[PDB]
Subunit: 417 residues, 4 copies
Amino acid sequence: MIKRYDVAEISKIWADENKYAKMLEVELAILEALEDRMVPKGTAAEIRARAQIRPERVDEIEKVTKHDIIAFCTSIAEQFTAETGKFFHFGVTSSDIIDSALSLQIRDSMSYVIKDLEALCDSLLTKAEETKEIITMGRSHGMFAEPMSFGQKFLGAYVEFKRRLKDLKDFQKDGLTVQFSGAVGNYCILTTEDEKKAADILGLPVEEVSTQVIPRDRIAKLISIHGLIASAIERLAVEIRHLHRSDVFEVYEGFSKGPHKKNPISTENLTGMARMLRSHVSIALENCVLWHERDISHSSAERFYLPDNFGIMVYALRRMKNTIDNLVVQRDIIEDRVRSTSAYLSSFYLHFLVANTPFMREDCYKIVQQVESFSKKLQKVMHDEHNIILDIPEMDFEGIKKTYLKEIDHVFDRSVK
Amino acid sequence: MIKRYDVAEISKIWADENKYAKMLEVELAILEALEDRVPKGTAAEIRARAQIRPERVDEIEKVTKHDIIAFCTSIAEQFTAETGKFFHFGVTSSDIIDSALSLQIRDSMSYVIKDLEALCDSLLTKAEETKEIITMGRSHGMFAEPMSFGQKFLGAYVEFKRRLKDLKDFQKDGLTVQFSGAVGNYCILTTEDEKKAADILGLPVEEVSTQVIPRDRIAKLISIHGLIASAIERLAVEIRHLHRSDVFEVYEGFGQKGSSTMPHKKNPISTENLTGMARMLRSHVSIALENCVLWHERDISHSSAERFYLPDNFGIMVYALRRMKNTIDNLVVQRDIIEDRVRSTSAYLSSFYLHFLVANTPFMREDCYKIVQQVGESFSKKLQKVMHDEHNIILDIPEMDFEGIKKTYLKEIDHVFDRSVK
Amino acid sequence: MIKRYDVAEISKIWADENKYAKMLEVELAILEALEDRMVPKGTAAEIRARAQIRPERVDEIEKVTKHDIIAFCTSIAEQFTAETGKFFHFGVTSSDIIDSALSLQIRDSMSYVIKDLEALCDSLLTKAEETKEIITMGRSHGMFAEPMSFGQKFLGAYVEFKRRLKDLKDFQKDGLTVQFSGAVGNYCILTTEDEKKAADILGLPVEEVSTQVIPRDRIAKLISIHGLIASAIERLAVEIRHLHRSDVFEVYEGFPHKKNPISTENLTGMARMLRSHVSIALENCVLWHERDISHSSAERFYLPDNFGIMVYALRRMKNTIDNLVVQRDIIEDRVRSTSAYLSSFYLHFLVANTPFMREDCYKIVQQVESFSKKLQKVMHDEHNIILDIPEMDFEGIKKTYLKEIDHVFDRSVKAR
Amino acid sequence: MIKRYDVAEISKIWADENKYAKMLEVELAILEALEDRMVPKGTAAEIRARAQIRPERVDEIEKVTKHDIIAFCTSIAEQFTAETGKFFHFGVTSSDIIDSALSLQIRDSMSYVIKDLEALCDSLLTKAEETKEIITMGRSHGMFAEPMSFGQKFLGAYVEFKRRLKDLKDFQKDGLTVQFSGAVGNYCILTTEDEKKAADILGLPVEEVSTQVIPRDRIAKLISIHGLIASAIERLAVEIRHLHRSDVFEVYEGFKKNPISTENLTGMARMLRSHVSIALENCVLWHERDISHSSAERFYLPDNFGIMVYALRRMKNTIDNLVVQRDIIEDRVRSTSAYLSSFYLHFLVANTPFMREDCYKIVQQVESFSKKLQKVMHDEHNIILDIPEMDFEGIKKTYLKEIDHVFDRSVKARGENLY
Ligand SMILES: O=C(O)/C=C/C(=O)O
Ligand SMILES: O=C(O)/C=C/C(=O)O
Ligand SMILES: O=C(O)/C=C/C(=O)O
Ligand SMILES: [K+]
Ligand SMILES: [K+]
Ligand SMILES: [K+]
Ligand SMILES: [K+]
């Protein structure tokens, strides 16, 4: 993480001050659970009141112990009497407290992700309803295709992020677990009853089968979800970058307070942001390949990409929302492009004569191509030349919008559950 | 996909014939929906005589340069000008492809689910057979504390059952169909015609579609398959560890010649082969992610890649699940070699003795550590003697014999199994 | 590989017939070297003439033996006597023959790539010299920046693919090796002299340290070169896709047929495929001790397609470049319709010449047919500066921006 | 990047002050070249004397302008009079200074990586010297195969890192460029003469064809090699972790014994691999530029060199301090025997007219193996030949026969005679 995109509350969760404090919150959970066995009643509350998080001293102790778990508990043990810290960190293994506290840093980070994601979904839906009645020329392969609702470009990103919102909220109810199983998950000292009571205090369910560590596929699943959101971010930014260029010139980003040129510098940044979150996916997958009950190759990688994952995501979910809000939509440039193009009308009259006349395609194709009001005279040819009586619709600007946007109301409500 | 790893039922789903066979059903599903607006029985009449001719489509495509128009030309040339008049009417080409691709994916997901359920059955079988086998747990590859050998398979079991439910969650709704026109404006078609045509196929309507269905659904499935690649790789590495000559706890059951000069040398060729398969599956998740960023209402940039990895990814997914199941069943467990390693090591007893004294006595940590150091005699009764004689305290120390170790380190093996089995 | 994207010459190399063929060539290369000592002379040449290559026979034997190399050598042995096939596959390990023959498939495939790569470099420079004098609007962040030579675009990809071309030419000389090192590379029966003889027969250098296998980071480096080519292709295809769109409409893919950049969109997905294999080869680098067979199944998948997609993609991009239709007037009418970029040109003109500061020269330019005469009228009257401002009409715009286009082309092409 | 693995000299290369200092070095390179034109002579040396880099001042200006280079110019411009700073940042576009200074940072980051990688090959070679004499068991699929030299494990990793060192020094020669071509590379205000002159002041060659930015295939060419280097780092790490396990117990890292070093470096290799895809995607820039690479390059470029320098020196120390337990090595060779049956099989077929399947039943039937075998074939088979007796020293003389040749071909200078 660098200072330019840093969000202080996100990096605070992954700062060593919160890393050690979450470890301590897990230590007091298993200590309070063991109070029903060999630990005196009230010992956990005694430590919870006077415990001080001292990261510099831990690093000082870590130089001697060469292990962050031995320096942490020592920094807590030297603040109390030997009778007090007797059963502190008792029965659990090193990664029992590390990963259980690791899942705490992940739970609290998800709240910032889910909140700003839903705030982004609302900003997209808001921008869709403003531009729902603006008609634009859809582009297939970059070519003009048929007129559509310009709000559907925003409604398309809305329903995508909305599917991502269900992915995160499903994980929040399930994927997060903790472990108090002991050394290699064999419960040499503790019991599953102790793990149950301790996990009940923390508020996260119990790992069904846990080795020395927590199985890394659970974190991998969450990071793979952020990869899906990144492709949604990138697709939305590419949409904005396309309509921002001079050849299109239908949207541009706000210029804050203040040589004055319009440039899509915001959504280009959000493209690089998505490139970072996409790269974390394989990292999460490789961290799943551990030897027997554990190897610690996942730790250093998690120290890097886990703080950047939530940090980049929250900064991206917030920057994307504000960029949509400050986005300037130029309606006259959007709808004039629909007026100047008429090539899509060749297929409209084609499907109209095929549907309402008993003529084949080639017969219906030769009549339209052989053909002010393109509707007025083509209707006369059916009655005069073909002796067929029917009323075509007038394909002026009001007939175009009424034809192609006649279903946009149904698309919006089927999007909103 | 190559013939060496080709799976019959899966390769047929993605071949040219069944590709067009599903596109035909999509053409007739929307055609029957248009019969309310198209004469009655037109889709049923085309359904009864339709022929899928992949060689003919290839010849039409050499001129038209459009696979869908070539498929339409091959189908319309089988009927009258009037009978095939409303064929491919109102829909866009991608309305046919993506709606049919879902039926292909669904037919592939049905086999993967069944093959993934089968692997969970085998893992839970070996977990029960090797449940009461005591083995040395290893952290950083180092001897740690003894544990159950069946805990390894149960650990892999619940992992595949996590991905199994995710697949079933995707099976309930992860795929859609669409009939939205050129750029999703529903100019010629209607939502009523689109919705009703979907129930003929049996899939939900895409909520917001452009020319194509959003690619994040395919990417979501590939994501569930990306995680499975990790699950397959870990179980493969685990058995590769046990199979080595230095450990020699298990070996893959094999007329088969393992080596040239040593018939039959036992090598973990199955779990190693599956590791290469996992590397191929993982690499596809970067393609499916990049395919989501399509320009405006569509670009065809995802078609070339999807023609490559989608048939291979499903073909490998089915091949890998089946071979791992055959390996898990035929893997033979050397019971004595596993348990003879646990007796040869005494290091884990010192940890249990010191946490026994701290829990049962008022002594502190480093006071207990020096006691167990100075302590063939019974380690339990000799230290219980010094507790009574030298330190003057009475405590009942369970004796750490070979079966006393299994009573200590396999204590919660019942509850771990109970909460794991569904 | 699939039938739609199958290339004839490339798929021929990776077929089981040639796969078994190059195995035989490698086997006969070491056995010919073993004739100098313990093997009767002339045995390798006798097997070379009578040995059939029967994939249906190998698969018939492999169904039992579960060992591809045993089934291969057995199929070759049964076509000779016990006295002609005595020392066939003697002393070598199974991967001595596989990895040596695998490099042969890589060598011959690589020649087709370099051929079709430099051929794509020819199409790019041909289009570059054609459109050198054309002037177009440059775009930064998609927004109109300044006028530029349209030929600089194709030259930008020319030198990029030229960079990838030298990387393969460097690799083709120093990239591949063979081996005959025994079971785990300890040289029990085999000697370095016999191995060097067989290697000199095949024509490839010897691996420095050989385990049971050849270090797979050699393959991974080749793929890395091809991974960069995937981005060079995608960047070039993305450029054509942008110019093709209706809002730009500067070029279109040549063949009422409908105009879409369908070929460059095809190459975008191809490029993602070539880029997907780079991390595959990297994970194959991490073997266990002397070897683990994990890399074979993955290479049986991605290597035949990596070479296939590469040649297939380079050829289609070559055909698309030559047949691409450039619309010169629309390209140059867009420069006539843009105006605001001249503010930066007149600004630096008054700064570098008139002793006025940046804020002073800015004021007057936008306060101010042909702008050069108007600005020079202001400098001569109120400012009272006598200076000659060059005409900024269409022809004068080409002279200003394309003034150094000769130096760019000459420095980017060796003999030019 | 985090302080836990931070290399101060590397994180300072990519810190804010060195970033601007290299940009200011590039700004004065073009300004000095323009002294042969409209810019007054000696103006570059004028600004270079009293130039003060103020990161927090630049951040203050960018908080309003939302443009990093305008903020970087204002901080340098306002320190002098208008006439002196009149020609500062003149004719160049932003990315002329952004990317050309980025090449200066990368070059400085490359100077450290080359040294560490070179020193790792020396230590790996040194460790191969200490362990060359030790006979070990070669493992195929983790299974016992044939005996080999233990030092060949360090020699195999040595020649791989040396191939990566040859890749890095090749890129060191031609790989980094500077650009002064202007807005879209059109040389509107400047000339190729101005660009060529300022390039010698910076010591780097001129980019052949540059758009608004420098094409990202050069940086991608460097990050790709770092992924190749990381592949060597994980293969060597997994090797040590294999020989470290309790069942093998053939090595242990120097100072309860855990391979925490090579496991941590294995995690270092995973982060470096992910950088490749970002470097490959940073090349796909729209037209003459888009800035989407910038935010990514602000992250993985300092993280790549920081992790790489750390991993090359930690693996060197791990190799420096790795303890080799020779007693456990060679007695594992004495314990098991299987390759011997393959040896006598290849020996009988070589020197006797019998066939492979004939000699296999003879070797399997069988105290001294060589003596007993030499008597069976002269009794019932009537074969007179010299069968070498293969004991521990006899096995070493056979399976380590060509070990000196593998070493001489692996090291360029070894084997040459001097004086
Ligand atoms: O008719 C179609 O569905 C395809 C149109 C297109 O190729 O743009
Ligand atoms: O050549 C052998 O001994 C067999 C080798 C292998 O199975 O790789
Ligand atoms: O004047 C410059 O160098 C920068 C211009 C820009 O911000 O694009
Ligand atoms: K645990
Ligand atoms: K559609
Ligand atoms: K070998
Ligand atoms: K430039």
